[PDB]
């Protein structure tokens, strides 16, 4: 079994490092003064970057892989997506959900993602997708720690037996309580739904992840209730507000007042760049707003924010290969986090910040932690992002669970020349 990871670069650290492994855990981390020779039981990072696993804090594995079945969304609109999904009703079965979820999960494993939080629609009396996902969670456990959010897609108070179904999902094992206040019939139902969500989270000792203010409505401010209730219960770490795209449209004065509460509350924020740029701003003509939450300001204020892919190859987001560096690339551009350091530190948005969002207790390259880490064939975060590098090796429990042999490009000039896109 692997005993050491050598010649590793670490974000924010100078030089090369050696990571000693023992019994599936990291036993020690020592600096090197030069390049170490490879040997049996040693995985050579070859001066590449070693980081804890990529994390997917927000994805919908119950709808993934269905784009084009039976028809494609030609307009690319949310409205048509709903219609196209409805046309696939007959195919939505236990086995179908498991098959599609597993397909995307395999892409995630290949992409060095070892932690995934999937929302699952529980506005379904049969709870078909949930029962399927609970089995998938057990099956994929050796490679990915999957969290399931009981997501009341049609509302808690605005859907028949919505609250009862949400609680049933928790009784069946869902890890996180979801909500969607801006989709409830009224602002009052929205606020009330959050009180019910928090009550359930405290009753069952579960995390919370709200689809919060995902709308270009400057009056959608459910985020303040999410943060206030978290602060009141002293449970910020266990709470997440997903999307908050409405924040992109708030006036600056309210946002400034709100930020004090956001920081004090300690709650987490998830932005989903690929989907947000696609679905937001659809009611604008020109100019058209970007519609992503205030990521840059959150980072400047020390508020934990991270990036999710949200949808993969489905009616609402037709693209994706479940690649976090791709999600990061889009987020850095749309959020204008384009300074060298901002780009280089970008990896935090798809690693450490996301681990905090999932309230992970065993994450990071540190002595005592499980030997879960990935190797990127790049010098630093900037380089990894610029070249959209694959994951050379993914290690879990001290064992390699995925590897990618990089593409080899050659140009035939007066003589053949290898091209690696580095200067």
Residues 33, 41, 74, 251: which binds a copy of itself (CB under 8 A)?
Answer: 251
Taking a C-beta distance cutoff of 8 angstroms, is the pair 413, 40 a contact? no
Across-strand partners of 399?
396
Least Å from the CB of residue 87 to a copy of itself = 19
Tokens describing residue 222: 């459910």
Q: Does 227 interact with a copy of itself (rule: CB under 8 A)?
A: yes
Asked if residue 6 lies in contact with residue 42, where contact means CB atoms within 8 angstroms, the answer is: yes
The total of other beta-carbon atoms located within 10 Å of residue 1's CB is 11
Single residue of 182, 243, 294, 356 touching a copy of itself by CB under 8 A:
182
Q: Cβ(146)–Cβ(120) under 8 Å?
A: no
Helix (H, G, I), strand (E, B) or coil at 389: coil
d(CA 364, CA 358): 13
Q: Nearest approach, Cβ of 64 to a copy of itself (angstroms)? A: 24
Instruction: Please identify which residue in 220, 293, 344, 394 interacts with a copy of itself, judged by CB under 8 A.
Output: 220
Within 224-351, strands assigned E span 239-243, 268-271, 305-307
Least Å distance, CB 265 to a copy of itself, is 8
CB of 306 to a copy of itself, least distance (A): 23
* Residue 297 contacts a copy of itself per CB under 8 A: no
CA dist., res. 52 & res. 54, Å (int):
7
- Residue 13 annotated as catalytic: no
Which of residues 257, 336, 406, 417 is near a copy of itself by CB under 8 A?
A: 257
Closest CA to 37 of 1, 8, 14, 6: 6
Which one-letter DSSP state was computed for residue 9? B
Please count the residues of this chain forming the interface with a copy of itself, following the rule CB under 8 A: 32
296 binds a copy of itself (CB under 8 A): no
Residues forming beta bridges with residue 147, ordered by sequence position:
117
Helix/strand/coil (H, E, C) string of 288-303? CCCCCCCHHHHHHHCC
Does residue 193 bind a copy of itself (CB under 8 A)? no
Instruction: Indicate the SS3 state at residue 195.
Output: helix
Q: Which of 22, 32, 93, 256 binds a copy of itself (CB under 8 A)?
A: 256
Q: 58 a known binding residue?
A: yes
| Touching a copy of itself, residues 262-291 (CB under 8 A) | 282-284
- Considering only residues 34, 37, 252, 302, which one is a binding residue for a copy of itself as defined by CB under 8 A? 252
Binding mask 299-338 for a copy of itself (x = CB under 8 A): ----------------------------------------
φ/ψ of 105, rounded to 5, equals -60, -35
Q: Was 248 annotated as part of a binding site?
A: no
Q: Determine the angle formed by the axes of helices 252-265 and 222-233, rounding to 10 degrees.
A: 30
- Residues 199-218 interacting with a copy of itself (rule: CB under 8 A): 215-218
Asked if 145 interacts with a copy of itself (CB under 8 A), we say: no
Site membership for a copy of itself, residue 163 (CB under 8 A): no
Residues in contact with a copy of itself by CB under 8 A are: 158, 182-183, 185-189, 191, 215-221, 224-225, 227-228, 231, 251-257, 261, 282-284
Catalytic residue ranges: 214
């Amino acid at each position: 079994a692997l005993q050491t990871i050598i010649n590793a670069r670490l974000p924010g650290e100078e030089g090369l490092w050696q990571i000693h492994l023992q019994d599936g855990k990291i036993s020690a981390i020592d600096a090197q003064s030069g390049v170490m020779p490879i040997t049996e039981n040693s995985l050579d990072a070859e001066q590449g970057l070693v980081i804890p696993p990529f994390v997917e804090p927000h994805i919908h594995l119950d709808t993934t892989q269905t784009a084009g079945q039976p028809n494609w969304n030609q307009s690319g609109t949310l409205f048509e997506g709903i219609e196209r999904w409805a046309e696939r009703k007959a195919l939505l079965t236990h086995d179908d959900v498991k098959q599609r979820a597993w397909q995307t999960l395999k892409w995630q494993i290949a992409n060095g993602i070892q932690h995934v939080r999937t929302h699952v629609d529980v506005s379904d009396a049969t709870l078909t997708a949930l029962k399927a996902m609970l089995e998938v969670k057990q099956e994929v456990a050796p490679w990915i720690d999957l969290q399931i959010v009981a997501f009341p897609q049609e509302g808690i108070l605005s859907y028949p037996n919505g609250e009862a179904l949400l609680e049933e999902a928790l009784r069946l094992g869902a890890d996180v309580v979801g909500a969607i206040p801006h989709f409830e019939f009224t602002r009052e139902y929205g606020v009330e739904s959050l009180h019910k969500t928090f009550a359930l989270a405290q009753k069952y000792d579960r995390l919370i992840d709200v689809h919060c203010d995902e709308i270009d409505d400057e009056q959608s401010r459910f985020v303040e209730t999410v943060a206030a209730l978290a602060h009141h219960e002293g449970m910020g770490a266990r709470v997440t507000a997903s999307h908050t795209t409405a924040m992109h449209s708030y006036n600056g004065a309210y946002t400034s007042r709100l930020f004090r509460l956001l920081k004090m509350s300690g709650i987490n924020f998830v932005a989903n760049p690929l989907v947000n740029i696609h679905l937001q701003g659809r009611f604008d003509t020109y100019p058209k707003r970007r519609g992503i939450t205030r990521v840059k300001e959150m980072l400047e204020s020390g508020i934990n924010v991270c990036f999710g892919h949200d949808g993969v190859f489905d009616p609402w987001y037709p693209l994706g290969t479940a690649n976090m560096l791709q999600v990061l690339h889009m987020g850095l551009h749309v959020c204008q986090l384009m300074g060298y350091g901002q780009i280089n530190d970008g990896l935090n948005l798809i690693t450490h910040h996301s681990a905090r969002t999932l309230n992970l207790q065993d994450y990071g390259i540190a002595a005592g932690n499980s030997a879960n880490l990935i190797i990127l064939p790049a010098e630093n975060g900037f380089d990894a992002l610029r070249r959209q590098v694959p994951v050379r090796y993914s290690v879990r429990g001290g064992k390699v669970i995925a590897s990618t042999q990089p593409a080899q490009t050659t140009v035939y000039l007066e003589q053949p020349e290898a091209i690696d896109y580095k200067r």
